[PDB]
Short mmCIF file of C-alpha atoms in Angstrom, two decimals:
data_model
loop_
_atom_site.label_atom_id
_atom_site.label_comp_id
_atom_site.label_asym_id
_atom_site.label_seq_id
_atom_site.Cartn_x
_atom_site.Cartn_y
_atom_site.Cartn_z
CA UNK H 157 130.87 142.14 24.14
CA UNK H 158 131.51 140.91 20.59
CA UNK H 159 134.12 138.35 21.70
CA UNK H 160 131.33 135.93 22.63
CA UNK H 161 129.73 136.22 19.18
CA UNK H 162 133.15 135.74 17.56
CA UNK H 163 133.70 132.60 19.65
CA UNK H 164 130.20 131.38 18.79
CA UNK H 165 130.70 131.68 15.03
CA UNK H 166 134.19 130.16 15.31
CA UNK H 167 132.65 127.12 17.00
CA UNK H 168 129.71 127.02 14.57
CA UNK H 169 131.90 126.84 11.48
CA UNK H 170 133.17 123.40 12.59
CA UNK H 171 129.88 121.75 13.63
CA UNK H 172 128.56 123.07 10.30
CA UNK H 173 130.32 120.11 8.61
CA UNK H 174 129.46 117.35 11.10
CA UNK H 175 126.36 115.88 9.41
CA UNK H 176 126.00 114.46 5.86
CA UNK H 177 125.35 117.29 3.43
CA UNK H 178 127.20 119.56 1.00
CA UNK H 179 127.59 123.24 1.83
CA UNK H 180 125.68 124.29 -1.28
CA UNK H 181 122.92 121.76 -0.59
CA UNK H 182 122.44 122.89 3.01
CA UNK H 183 122.49 126.52 1.88
CA UNK H 184 119.84 125.84 -0.77
CA UNK H 185 117.54 124.01 1.64
CA UNK H 186 118.07 126.64 4.34
CA UNK H 187 117.11 129.37 1.86
CA UNK H 188 114.03 127.38 0.85
CA UNK H 189 112.89 127.04 4.46
CA UNK H 190 113.74 130.70 5.06
CA UNK H 191 111.25 131.40 2.27
CA UNK H 192 108.87 129.16 4.23
CA UNK H 193 109.49 130.33 7.82
CA UNK H 194 108.12 133.84 8.55
CA UNK H 195 110.51 134.42 11.47
CA UNK H 196 113.41 134.70 9.00
CA UNK H 197 111.44 135.42 5.83
CA UNK H 198 112.97 138.27 3.77
CA UNK H 199 109.53 139.91 3.34
CA UNK H 200 107.95 139.65 6.79
CA UNK H 201 107.81 142.65 9.12
CA UNK H 202 110.16 142.23 12.15
CA UNK H 203 107.87 143.94 14.63
CA UNK H 204 109.19 144.61 18.16
CA UNK H 205 107.21 142.03 20.13
CA UNK H 206 107.73 138.52 21.44
CA UNK H 207 107.68 135.59 19.00
CA UNK H 208 107.40 131.89 19.84
CA UNK H 209 108.24 129.66 16.86
CA UNK H 210 107.91 125.87 16.77
CA UNK H 211 109.49 123.55 14.19
CA UNK H 212 108.19 119.98 14.10
CA UNK H 213 108.61 116.87 11.99
CA UNK H 214 109.81 113.26 12.00
CA UNK H 215 113.16 112.17 13.43
CA UNK H 216 116.22 113.98 12.14
CA UNK H 217 115.17 115.38 8.78
CA UNK H 218 117.13 118.64 8.88
CA UNK H 219 115.42 120.90 11.42
CA UNK H 220 118.40 120.99 13.80
CA UNK H 221 120.71 122.03 10.95
CA UNK H 222 118.17 124.73 10.07
CA UNK H 223 118.28 126.11 13.59
CA UNK H 224 122.10 126.01 13.61
CA UNK H 225 122.33 127.78 10.25
CA UNK H 226 119.89 130.47 11.39
CA UNK H 227 121.95 131.08 14.53
CA UNK H 228 125.12 131.26 12.43
CA UNK H 229 123.40 133.76 10.13
CA UNK H 230 122.56 135.85 13.19
CA UNK H 231 126.20 135.65 14.26
CA UNK H 232 127.15 136.96 10.81
CA UNK H 233 124.57 139.78 11.17
CA UNK H 234 123.41 139.06 7.62
CA UNK H 235 119.64 139.34 8.19
CA UNK H 236 117.25 141.56 10.15
CA UNK H 237 119.85 142.58 12.77
CA UNK H 238 117.29 143.01 15.56
CA UNK H 239 118.83 141.04 18.47
CA UNK H 240 122.06 142.10 20.18
CA UNK H 241 122.85 138.71 21.75
CA UNK H 242 121.51 135.16 21.64
CA UNK H 243 121.92 131.82 23.41
CA UNK H 244 121.48 128.15 22.49
CA UNK H 245 119.93 125.75 25.02
CA UNK H 246 120.41 121.98 24.74
CA UNK H 247 117.63 120.00 26.42
CA UNK H 248 119.88 116.94 26.55
CA UNK H 249 122.27 118.77 28.88
CA UNK H 250 119.47 120.26 30.98
CA UNK H 251 117.80 116.86 31.45
CA UNK H 252 120.58 115.64 33.75
CA UNK H 253 120.84 119.03 35.48
CA UNK H 254 119.34 119.44 38.94
CA UNK H 255 117.43 122.29 40.57
CA UNK H 256 118.94 125.67 39.75
CA UNK H 257 118.09 129.29 39.08
CA UNK H 258 117.07 130.22 35.55
CA UNK H 259 119.83 132.83 35.33
CA UNK H 260 122.53 130.33 36.27
CA UNK H 261 120.83 127.65 34.16
CA UNK H 262 121.23 129.76 31.02
CA UNK H 263 124.57 131.27 32.14
CA UNK H 264 126.34 128.01 32.99
CA UNK H 265 127.76 127.69 29.47
CA UNK H 266 129.57 131.06 29.59
CA UNK H 267 132.20 131.34 32.37
CA UNK H 268 131.66 135.09 32.89
CA UNK H 269 127.96 135.86 32.34
CA UNK H 270 127.27 135.96 36.09
CA UNK H 271 129.15 139.26 36.40
CA UNK H 272 126.35 141.26 34.69
CA UNK H 273 123.14 139.59 35.85
CA UNK H 274 120.98 142.77 36.03
CA UNK H 275 121.72 144.32 32.63
CA UNK H 276 121.76 141.02 30.75
CA UNK H 277 118.55 139.67 32.28
CA UNK H 278 116.60 142.95 32.24
CA UNK H 279 117.12 143.61 28.51
CA UNK H 280 114.50 141.04 27.56
CA UNK H 281 113.80 142.48 24.10
CA UNK H 282 117.46 142.19 23.03
CA UNK H 283 117.79 138.41 23.57
CA UNK H 284 117.01 135.53 21.21
CA UNK H 285 116.68 131.93 22.41
CA UNK H 286 117.04 128.61 20.62
CA UNK H 287 116.01 125.22 22.00
CA UNK H 288 116.68 121.76 20.54
CA UNK H 289 115.46 118.29 21.44
CA UNK H 290 112.56 119.45 23.60
CA UNK H 291 110.92 116.00 23.53
CA UNK H 292 114.21 114.55 24.84
CA UNK H 293 113.94 116.49 28.11
CA UNK H 294 111.98 113.76 29.89
CA UNK H 295 109.93 116.15 32.04
CA UNK H 296 106.36 115.39 33.07
CA UNK H 297 103.48 117.58 31.81
CA UNK H 298 102.39 118.45 35.35
CA UNK H 299 105.86 119.62 36.36
CA UNK H 300 106.01 121.80 33.24
CA UNK H 301 102.55 123.25 33.90
CA UNK H 302 102.58 123.74 37.67
CA UNK H 303 104.25 126.23 40.02
CA UNK H 304 105.07 129.13 37.73
CA UNK H 305 107.22 132.07 38.80
CA UNK H 306 108.04 135.59 37.65
CA UNK H 307 111.69 135.94 38.74
CA UNK H 308 114.90 134.41 37.38
CA UNK H 309 116.66 134.48 40.73
CA UNK H 310 114.26 131.84 42.08
CA UNK H 311 115.78 128.37 42.45
CA UNK H 312 113.45 125.65 41.17
CA UNK H 313 113.64 122.33 39.31
CA UNK H 314 114.53 122.46 35.62
CA UNK H 315 111.01 121.55 34.35
CA UNK H 316 109.54 124.41 36.39
CA UNK H 317 111.98 126.93 34.91
CA UNK H 318 111.50 125.70 31.34
CA UNK H 319 107.71 125.74 31.66
CA UNK H 320 107.79 129.24 33.13
CA UNK H 321 109.95 130.44 30.23
CA UNK H 322 107.67 128.80 27.66
CA UNK H 323 104.53 130.07 29.41
CA UNK H 324 105.89 133.65 29.13
CA UNK H 325 105.66 134.27 32.88
CA UNK H 326 109.07 135.98 32.81
CA UNK H 327 111.20 137.84 30.26
CA UNK H 328 108.04 138.60 28.23
CA UNK H 329 109.88 140.62 25.57
CA UNK H 330 112.21 137.83 24.42
CA UNK H 331 111.98 135.67 21.29
CA UNK H 332 112.10 131.87 21.29
CA UNK H 333 112.48 129.14 18.67
CA UNK H 334 112.33 125.38 19.26
CA UNK H 335 112.63 122.12 17.31
CA UNK H 336 111.09 118.85 18.46
CA UNK H 337 109.15 115.74 17.50
CA UNK H 338 105.41 116.09 16.83
CA UNK H 339 104.40 114.69 20.23
CA UNK H 340 105.73 117.89 21.83
CA UNK H 341 103.43 120.01 19.65
CA UNK H 342 100.37 119.22 21.78
CA UNK H 343 102.19 120.09 25.00
CA UNK H 344 103.54 123.33 23.52
CA UNK H 345 100.13 124.47 22.26
CA UNK H 346 98.69 123.71 25.71
CA UNK H 347 101.62 125.48 27.42
CA UNK H 348 102.80 128.37 25.22
CA UNK H 349 101.18 131.55 23.91
CA UNK H 350 101.44 133.72 20.79
CA UNK H 351 102.71 130.72 18.78
CA UNK H 352 103.55 130.16 15.13
CA UNK H 353 103.97 126.60 13.84
CA UNK H 354 106.01 125.42 10.84
CA UNK H 355 106.66 121.95 9.42
CA UNK H 356 109.82 120.51 7.86
CA UNK H 357 109.85 118.05 4.94
CA UNK H 358 113.44 117.50 3.81
CA UNK H 359 115.03 116.35 0.56
CA UNK H 360 112.91 116.47 -2.59
CA UNK H 361 113.36 114.23 -5.62
CA UNK H 362 115.79 116.63 -7.31
CA UNK H 363 117.71 116.94 -4.04
CA UNK H 364 118.04 113.14 -3.86
CA UNK H 365 119.20 112.98 -7.48
CA UNK H 366 121.79 115.70 -6.88
CA UNK H 367 123.00 113.95 -3.73
CA UNK H 368 123.42 110.69 -5.65
CA UNK H 369 125.28 112.49 -8.44
CA UNK H 370 127.65 114.14 -5.95
CA UNK H 371 128.19 110.98 -3.88
CA UNK H 372 128.85 108.60 -6.77
CA UNK H 373 130.46 111.19 -9.04
CA UNK H 374 129.26 109.39 -12.18
CA UNK H 375 126.09 109.98 -14.20
CA UNK H 376 125.36 106.31 -14.92
CA UNK H 377 126.06 105.01 -11.40
CA UNK H 378 124.21 107.95 -9.85
CA UNK H 379 121.13 107.27 -11.99
CA UNK H 380 121.35 103.54 -11.21
CA UNK H 381 121.40 104.26 -7.47
CA UNK H 382 118.59 106.82 -7.76
CA UNK H 383 116.29 104.48 -9.71
CA UNK H 384 117.13 101.57 -7.40
CA UNK H 385 115.90 103.69 -4.48
CA UNK H 386 112.79 104.72 -6.43
CA UNK H 387 111.86 101.03 -6.74
CA UNK H 388 110.65 100.86 -3.11
CA UNK H 389 107.86 103.31 -2.25
CA UNK H 390 108.15 103.06 1.54
CA UNK H 391 111.93 103.45 1.37
CA UNK H 392 111.52 106.29 -1.12
CA UNK H 393 109.29 108.15 1.34
CA UNK H 394 111.65 107.20 4.16
CA UNK H 395 114.42 108.74 2.04
CA UNK H 396 113.36 112.30 2.86
CA UNK H 397 115.96 112.26 5.66
CA UNK H 398 119.53 112.96 4.46
CA UNK H 399 120.71 110.33 6.96
CA UNK H 400 118.63 107.74 5.09
CA UNK H 401 120.10 109.08 1.85
CA UNK H 402 123.62 108.57 3.19
CA UNK H 403 122.75 105.04 4.35
CA UNK H 404 121.30 104.20 0.93
CA UNK H 405 124.26 105.68 -0.93
CA UNK H 406 126.81 103.81 1.19
CA UNK H 407 124.95 100.50 0.95
CA UNK H 408 124.41 100.69 -2.82
CA UNK H 409 127.96 101.88 -3.50
CA UNK H 410 129.38 99.03 -1.43
CA UNK H 411 127.11 96.48 -3.10
CA UNK H 412 128.05 97.70 -6.59
CA UNK H 413 131.75 97.61 -5.73
CA UNK H 414 131.43 94.12 -4.21
CA UNK H 415 129.25 92.89 -7.08
CA UNK H 416 126.06 92.22 -5.10
CA UNK H 417 122.70 92.55 -6.85
CA UNK H 418 120.96 95.62 -5.34
CA UNK H 419 117.31 95.06 -6.33
CA UNK H 420 116.67 92.28 -3.75
CA UNK H 421 118.20 94.54 -1.10
CA UNK H 422 115.93 97.42 -2.16
CA UNK H 423 112.89 95.12 -2.24
CA UNK H 424 112.34 95.58 1.51
CA UNK H 425 113.64 98.34 3.78
CA UNK H 426 114.24 95.90 6.64
CA UNK H 427 116.74 94.19 4.36
CA UNK H 428 118.39 97.53 3.62
CA UNK H 429 118.78 98.37 7.31
CA UNK H 430 120.09 94.88 8.09
CA UNK H 431 122.61 95.15 5.25
CA UNK H 432 123.76 98.54 6.54
CA UNK H 433 124.16 97.12 10.04
CA UNK H 434 126.14 94.16 8.69
CA UNK H 435 128.43 96.36 6.59
CA UNK H 436 129.11 99.13 9.09
CA UNK H 437 130.33 97.28 12.17
CA UNK H 438 133.99 96.12 12.16
CA UNK H 439 135.10 92.52 12.44
CA UNK H 440 136.04 90.74 15.65
CA UNK H 441 134.63 88.41 18.28
CA UNK H 442 132.10 88.48 21.13
CA UNK H 443 130.12 91.20 19.35
CA UNK H 444 127.06 89.66 21.02
CA UNK H 445 127.47 91.72 24.19
CA UNK H 446 127.87 94.97 22.27
CA UNK H 447 124.81 94.28 20.13
CA UNK H 448 122.79 93.24 23.19
CA UNK H 449 123.66 96.46 25.04
CA UNK H 450 122.87 98.53 21.94
CA UNK H 451 119.49 96.82 21.57
CA UNK H 452 118.73 97.23 25.28
CA UNK H 453 119.49 100.95 25.14
CA UNK H 454 117.41 101.36 21.97
CA UNK H 455 114.43 99.61 23.56
CA UNK H 456 114.75 101.64 26.77
CA UNK H 457 114.83 104.87 24.78
CA UNK H 458 111.89 103.84 22.60
CA UNK H 459 109.71 102.97 25.60
CA UNK H 460 110.41 106.42 27.07
CA UNK H 461 110.01 107.98 23.59
CA UNK H 462 113.60 109.24 23.42
CA UNK H 463 116.59 108.82 21.11
CA UNK H 464 119.45 110.10 23.31
CA UNK H 465 121.94 108.40 25.63
CA UNK H 466 123.65 109.99 28.64
CA UNK H 467 126.90 109.05 30.35
CA UNK H 468 125.25 109.03 33.79
CA UNK H 469 122.80 106.23 32.96
CA UNK H 470 125.48 104.39 30.97
CA UNK H 471 127.87 104.45 33.94
CA UNK H 472 125.20 103.44 36.45
CA UNK H 473 124.30 100.54 34.13
CA UNK H 474 127.96 99.60 33.60
CA UNK H 475 128.70 100.01 29.89
CA UNK H 476 132.17 99.16 28.62
CA UNK H 477 134.29 101.94 27.15
CA UNK H 478 135.15 99.70 24.19
CA UNK H 479 131.47 99.18 23.34
CA UNK H 480 130.72 102.91 23.29
CA UNK H 481 133.86 103.54 21.25
CA UNK H 482 132.88 100.87 18.71
CA UNK H 483 129.40 102.38 18.45
CA UNK H 484 131.02 105.76 17.77
CA UNK H 485 133.48 104.60 15.09
CA UNK H 486 130.65 103.03 13.08
CA UNK H 487 128.65 106.28 13.08
CA UNK H 488 125.79 104.27 14.60
CA UNK H 489 125.51 106.88 17.37
CA UNK H 490 126.93 110.40 17.12
CA UNK H 491 128.12 112.86 19.77
CA UNK H 492 128.14 116.66 19.61
CA UNK H 493 130.97 118.37 21.49
CA UNK H 494 128.55 121.18 22.37
CA UNK H 495 126.87 118.62 24.66
CA UNK H 496 129.82 116.36 25.52
CA UNK H 497 128.66 113.34 27.49
CA UNK H 498 125.49 112.95 25.41
CA UNK H 499 124.94 110.73 22.37
CA UNK H 500 122.21 110.29 19.77
CA UNK H 501 121.20 107.50 17.42
CA UNK H 502 121.77 107.77 13.68
CA UNK H 503 118.03 107.72 12.97
CA UNK H 504 114.74 106.68 14.55
CA UNK H 505 114.16 103.91 11.99
CA UNK H 506 117.41 102.27 13.09
CA UNK H 507 116.31 102.60 16.72
CA UNK H 508 113.00 100.87 15.96
CA UNK H 509 114.86 98.14 14.06
CA UNK H 510 117.16 97.66 17.05
CA UNK H 511 114.19 97.50 19.44
CA UNK H 512 112.51 94.84 17.31
CA UNK H 513 115.83 92.98 17.25
CA UNK H 514 116.03 93.29 21.04
CA UNK H 515 112.67 91.57 21.28
CA UNK H 516 113.96 89.04 18.72
CA UNK H 517 117.00 88.03 20.79
CA UNK H 518 117.03 85.15 23.26
CA UNK H 519 116.81 86.43 26.84
CA UNK H 520 119.42 85.39 29.41
CA UNK H 521 118.80 85.00 33.13
CA UNK H 522 121.97 86.86 34.13
CA UNK H 523 120.44 90.24 33.29
CA UNK H 524 117.26 89.36 35.18
CA UNK H 525 119.28 88.36 38.25
CA UNK H 526 120.94 91.79 38.17
CA UNK H 527 119.85 94.50 40.59
CA UNK H 528 119.25 97.05 37.83
CA UNK H 529 115.62 97.97 37.12
CA UNK H 530 114.18 98.55 33.65
CA UNK H 531 110.70 99.56 32.46
CA UNK H 532 110.91 97.13 29.52
CA UNK H 533 107.62 95.42 28.72
CA UNK H 534 107.07 92.13 26.95
CA UNK H 535 106.39 91.34 23.29
CA UNK H 536 102.64 90.98 23.76
CA UNK H 537 102.61 94.33 25.57
CA UNK H 538 104.19 95.88 22.47
CA UNK H 539 101.63 94.14 20.25
CA UNK H 540 98.68 95.22 22.42
CA UNK H 541 96.54 97.90 20.81
CA UNK H 542 96.26 100.01 23.96
CA UNK H 543 100.04 100.42 23.98
CA UNK H 544 99.90 101.28 20.27
CA UNK H 545 97.54 104.10 21.23
CA UNK H 546 99.88 105.11 24.07
CA UNK H 547 103.12 104.94 22.03
CA UNK H 548 102.85 105.48 18.24
CA UNK H 549 106.39 104.16 17.71
CA UNK H 550 105.24 100.59 18.38
CA UNK H 551 103.38 100.15 15.07
CA UNK H 552 106.64 100.66 13.17
CA UNK H 553 108.22 98.35 15.75
CA UNK H 554 105.52 95.82 14.90
CA UNK H 555 106.33 96.18 11.20
CA UNK H 556 110.04 95.65 11.82
CA UNK H 557 109.44 92.68 14.15
CA UNK H 558 107.31 91.13 11.41
CA UNK H 559 110.14 91.76 8.96
CA UNK H 560 112.77 90.31 11.29
CA UNK H 561 110.68 87.13 11.56
CA UNK H 562 112.22 86.14 8.21
CA UNK H 563 114.50 83.11 8.44
CA UNK H 564 117.16 84.30 5.99
CA UNK H 565 117.58 87.62 7.81
CA UNK H 566 117.88 85.77 11.11
CA UNK H 567 120.55 83.43 9.75
CA UNK H 568 122.51 86.32 8.25
CA UNK H 569 122.34 88.32 11.48
CA UNK H 570 123.37 85.35 13.62
CA UNK H 571 126.30 84.63 11.30
CA UNK H 572 127.57 88.21 11.19
CA UNK H 573 127.02 89.18 14.84
CA UNK H 574 126.98 85.76 16.53
CA UNK H 575 123.65 86.37 18.28
CA UNK H 576 121.06 83.68 18.99
CA UNK H 577 117.35 83.73 18.13
CA UNK H 578 114.43 82.20 20.03
CA UNK H 579 111.37 80.59 18.38
CA UNK H 580 108.93 81.55 21.16
CA UNK H 581 109.09 85.19 20.07
CA UNK H 582 107.89 84.05 16.64
CA UNK H 583 105.06 82.08 18.26
CA UNK H 584 104.00 85.32 19.95
CA UNK H 585 103.11 86.62 16.48
CA UNK H 586 100.77 83.68 15.90
CA UNK H 587 99.34 84.15 19.40
CA UNK H 588 97.78 87.44 18.20
CA UNK H 589 97.86 87.29 14.37
CA UNK H 590 96.73 90.94 14.36
CA UNK H 591 93.32 89.27 14.13
CA UNK H 592 91.29 90.81 11.30
CA UNK H 593 88.76 88.20 10.11
CA UNK H 594 86.14 89.71 12.41
CA UNK H 595 83.80 92.54 11.55
CA UNK H 596 85.32 94.92 14.11
CA UNK H 597 88.29 95.51 11.79
CA UNK H 598 88.62 98.43 9.38
CA UNK H 599 89.91 98.51 5.81
CA UNK H 600 93.14 100.11 7.03
CA UNK H 601 93.59 97.25 9.51
CA UNK H 602 93.47 94.67 6.72
CA UNK H 603 95.79 96.80 4.59
CA UNK H 604 98.28 97.02 7.46
CA UNK H 605 98.13 93.27 8.04
CA UNK H 606 98.77 92.73 4.33
CA UNK H 607 101.71 95.14 4.50
CA UNK H 608 103.24 93.35 7.48
CA UNK H 609 102.82 89.95 5.81
CA UNK H 610 104.37 91.32 2.61
CA UNK H 611 107.30 92.68 4.62
CA UNK H 612 107.77 89.28 6.27
CA UNK H 613 108.54 87.68 2.88
CA UNK H 614 107.91 84.24 4.39
CA UNK H 615 105.35 81.92 2.81
CA UNK H 616 104.41 79.77 5.82
CA UNK H 617 103.56 82.69 8.12
CA UNK H 618 101.37 84.33 5.47
CA UNK H 619 99.68 80.98 4.81
CA UNK H 620 98.93 80.47 8.50
CA UNK H 621 97.69 84.04 9.03
CA UNK H 622 95.55 84.07 5.87
CA UNK H 623 93.86 80.70 6.47
CA UNK H 624 91.53 82.33 9.01
CA UNK H 625 89.69 84.26 6.28
CA UNK H 626 86.27 82.94 5.25
CA UNK H 627 85.41 86.20 3.45
CA UNK H 628 87.59 88.94 1.97
CA UNK H 629 87.10 92.50 0.75
CA UNK H 630 89.88 94.44 -0.99
CA UNK H 631 90.07 98.06 -2.15
CA UNK H 632 93.02 98.49 -4.48
CA UNK H 633 95.10 101.36 -5.81
CA UNK H 634 98.20 100.99 -7.97
CA UNK H 635 100.41 100.94 -4.87
CA UNK H 636 98.29 98.33 -3.07
CA UNK H 637 98.43 95.80 -5.92
CA UNK H 638 101.74 94.13 -5.02
CA UNK H 639 101.15 93.23 -1.35
CA UNK H 640 97.51 92.26 -1.82
CA UNK H 641 98.49 90.08 -4.78
CA UNK H 642 101.26 88.37 -2.81
CA UNK H 643 99.12 87.73 0.28
CA UNK H 644 95.82 86.84 -1.40
CA UNK H 645 97.59 84.16 -3.46
CA UNK H 646 97.81 82.05 -0.29
CA UNK H 647 94.28 82.12 1.16
CA UNK H 648 92.38 78.92 0.39
CA UNK H 649 89.39 78.96 2.80
CA UNK H 650 87.44 81.94 1.44
CA UNK H 651 83.87 81.56 0.18
CA UNK H 652 83.03 85.09 -1.02
CA UNK H 653 85.02 88.01 -2.42
CA UNK H 654 84.41 91.68 -3.18
CA UNK H 655 86.62 93.93 -5.31
CA UNK H 656 86.99 97.66 -5.81
CA UNK H 657 89.81 99.05 -7.96
CA UNK H 658 89.96 102.82 -7.53
CA UNK H 659 90.55 105.15 -10.46
CA UNK H 660 94.11 106.39 -10.93
CA UNK H 661 94.72 110.07 -11.66
CA UNK H 673 98.37 109.34 -22.03
CA UNK H 674 97.34 105.72 -22.54
CA UNK H 675 100.75 104.86 -24.01
CA UNK H 676 102.42 106.03 -20.80
CA UNK H 677 100.09 103.72 -18.87
CA UNK H 678 100.82 100.83 -21.26
CA UNK H 679 104.53 101.22 -20.54
CA UNK H 680 103.62 100.31 -16.96
CA UNK H 681 100.90 97.72 -17.76
CA UNK H 682 103.64 95.65 -19.38
CA UNK H 683 105.01 95.48 -15.82
CA UNK H 684 101.64 95.10 -14.07
CA UNK H 685 100.75 91.97 -16.07
CA UNK H 686 102.17 89.36 -13.62
CA UNK H 687 100.67 91.02 -10.54
CA UNK H 688 97.05 90.84 -11.71
CA UNK H 689 97.76 87.42 -13.19
CA UNK H 690 98.48 86.27 -9.64
CA UNK H 691 95.46 88.07 -8.18
CA UNK H 692 93.08 86.48 -10.69
CA UNK H 693 94.33 82.93 -10.03
CA UNK H 694 92.27 82.72 -6.83
CA UNK H 695 89.20 81.36 -8.62
CA UNK H 696 91.03 78.33 -10.01
CA UNK H 697 93.03 77.50 -6.89
CA UNK H 698 90.20 77.69 -4.36
CA UNK H 699 87.29 75.24 -4.39
CA UNK H 700 84.57 76.94 -2.30
CA UNK H 701 84.36 80.50 -3.70
CA UNK H 702 80.73 80.44 -4.80
CA UNK H 703 80.14 84.21 -4.73
CA UNK H 704 81.82 87.21 -6.32
CA UNK H 705 81.19 90.95 -6.48
CA UNK H 706 82.88 93.86 -8.27
CA UNK H 707 81.68 97.23 -6.97
CA UNK H 708 82.63 100.61 -8.45
#
């Protein structure tokens, strides 16, 4: 009876240390989100009826650790004490599983649960369920919606069983909690009933500062690392994930020890990720094959909107044991012994970077001649707007492909990994230009084009993309000054210009920053002198 709970907590106490974070930090953040989540809130009535709880948010970002800590707390019987037994279901394992009964599907983890099917299954109000990586299942919406059933003994495909459980067609008195990416939220709200939805944010500014202090161990170095990260707004927002915090800490610590200047690295997040990739992998030869396979797997996962690898597909494709081992030693992909045979990427940003790099690599005919079949599209397919609507991940992939178009990054990557780059992929960017000169574009479209050009950090590409503009209209906040100033410095065919600088939400405090803003607006106001056909101007609101 209690032996299973004892085993569960014994196993939990080890996986509790398998992901970057200090015990006190994880406890603090778990208590915060306990204050947030009603299902475990100290001051929410635990009424005896079914609950369906959904946790959603960007990749990684702590939700899985929250679920694990809540299950461990249940095992310790330190809160509520309403459920006699509980189970944890891994969608990554179930994805490769074939048709089965629901009872055996949930029992397969425990060698001896099949001996008490009636009592264990009937007591629906005494059982708590946890599900992780729902979006990684790979099931179709129709399979999840169709052919429901009211009995566990029925043998059906895994999507049917999971949809029936979520749809509350069976075991109506049980409680369920899931964590997944936002794209699964729509399916769950269409599929489930009696739901409660909660969002996860991650590390706050004080959490980041404390993490830097603990990692570096020195006040001055910790503050230097923290302020270096604060320099980049996009990276700072991307730093909500503790995995990103660990990457930043490792990169900055290594650069400081080696004597490298960190500000240019922190200027662009593509540079930070490339530096991390360069530093992490060991030395050797013929790394090209390993990097190519990694990039292929990343692209295949991104197209299917997944971030997990399975041994079945790897073996059918023919991956080398050494390549998988090398990936593991570098912490690039991590395995959980609870789901042995399954692997996950370090973070989704790294996966998008690797997909953009995949598209950046020169393509060999040997892979094409192979009998294996892939659903990989082409570069223009990724750049097409319809696919952007279909797959949101491609806009970030577009950003990172724009960033990887830099020549210095390409040379560094070729030198460190031995890969080869093709110029046609770069011509694909000009073939579309993310055309914006026309009137069908929005303000956000122009802002995004400016952001991509700023991320490129290459003068010729920005010059060639900005020459198409005969008229320009810019709406500027304090954040939007830098990229607009960089890009607008290059346009020399405009004839008319409109400006709107929005009001920011203590004048000495603002002067302390105007002393820094001086060059930026100096560049932006040089357009009149440089150009020779700007007859008209307007400054509105």
